[PDB]
Design a protein around this ligand. Structure first.
Ligand SMILES: Nc1ncnc2c1ncn2[C@@H]1O[C@H](COP(=O)(O)OP(=O)(O)OP(O)(O)=S)[C@@H](O)[C@H]1O
Length: 290
């Protein structure tokens, strides 16, 4: 990880600590409910690295990928999953990081991926790149993203991106993200697999009930419920008396099987976030843009 610069080492270091990672890994197993998207990704990005000269007049015209969908449905997880298959250096970039002159980060980001051999750039929440003197910050940055993105054999740089609000992306920005993919909320079989992933070290119609009680919850919400519920059992009972002394390390009493009541209490905390009216918009966007 050694590079020449004409930049502020402050900016260069921020990037190194926050954006760049190589060891961070995500197996495809660990992502549930996306069997079709995984195929699409693997074709657009992974396979083209395994057989480059094989792609000629079927070369994947896709330069970058846009994944579309509501919050917390596995989009970042998929992006990480590619970088671990391909053993590339992973750049997890927010669009907030880009905004905070402010352009130079974008030019640096790509200039760092270029040197860092095979890279994968993932630009989260790229809706926000667009939309008086403050909005001028965003127009100069969008300008530099579109110039850099055209810069896309093991010197390969991949450009994945993600948005909750796809309808806020103009034609100029569409040309750069040729492949589009819908990452919906988990299906009934999808939501049940997600629970198998999260509850695997803890404590079916039980979990199908739970899965069937979700119905419009994102993968992130379901994971939290498990976190909460998993934690709920022992609190109210085992240390409900709150004896500071007594709660010493008495790990003999470790088995505290988490109940159904817990998952029903956990469910009450957060109510469904994404309306069927919101999903209408996603359904429509991939209609014409996929
Ligand atoms: N299909 C899934 N399989 C496993 N975990 C999931 C899944 N979907 C969501 N999650 C949870 O929520 C995160 C999924 O990544 P995503 O949140 O979709 O990426 P994102 O939607 O761009 O992220 P945000 O919105 O910036 S927090 C993980 O940390 C998981 O705990």
């Amino acid at each position: 990880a050694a590079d020449s610069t004409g930049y502020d080492k402050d900016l260069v270091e921020a990037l190194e600590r926050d954006i760049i990672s190589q060891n961070p890994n995500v197996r495809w197993d660990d992502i549930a409910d996306l069997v079709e998207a995984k195929k699409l990704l693997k074709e657009a990005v992974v396979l083209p690295m395994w057989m480059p000269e094989f792609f000629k007049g079927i070369r994947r015209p896709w330069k970058g990928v846009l994944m579309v969908g509501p919050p917390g449905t596995g989009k970042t997880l998929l992006a990480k999953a590619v970088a671990t298959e391909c053993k590339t250096t992973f750049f997890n970039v927010s669009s907030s990081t880009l905004t905070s002159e402010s352009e130079k980060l974008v030019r640096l980001l790509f200039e760092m991926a270029r040197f860092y051999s095979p890279a994968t750039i993932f630009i989260d929440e790229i809706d926000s790149i667009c939309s008086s003197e403050e909005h001028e910050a965003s127009r100069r940055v969008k300008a530099e993203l579109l110039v850099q993105m055209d810069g896309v054999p093991s010197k390969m740089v991949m450009v994945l991106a993600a948005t909750n609000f796809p309808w806020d992306i103009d034609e100029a920005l569409r040309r750069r993200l040729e492949k589009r993919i819908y990452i919906p909320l988990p299906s009934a079989k999808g939501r049940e697999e997600l629970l198998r992933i999260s509850l695997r070290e803890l404590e079916d119609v039980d979990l199908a009930s739970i899965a069937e009680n979700m119905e419009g919850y994102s993968g992130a919400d379901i994971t939290n419920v498990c976190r909460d519920a998993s934690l709920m059992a022992m609190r109210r009972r085992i240390e409900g008396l709150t004896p500071e002394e007594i709660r010493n390390l008495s790990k003999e009493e470790m088995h505290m099987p988490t109940t159904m009541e817990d998952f029903e209490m956990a469910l009450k905390k957060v109510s469904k976030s994404v309306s069927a009216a919101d999903i209408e918009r996603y359904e429509k966007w991939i209609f014409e843009f996929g």
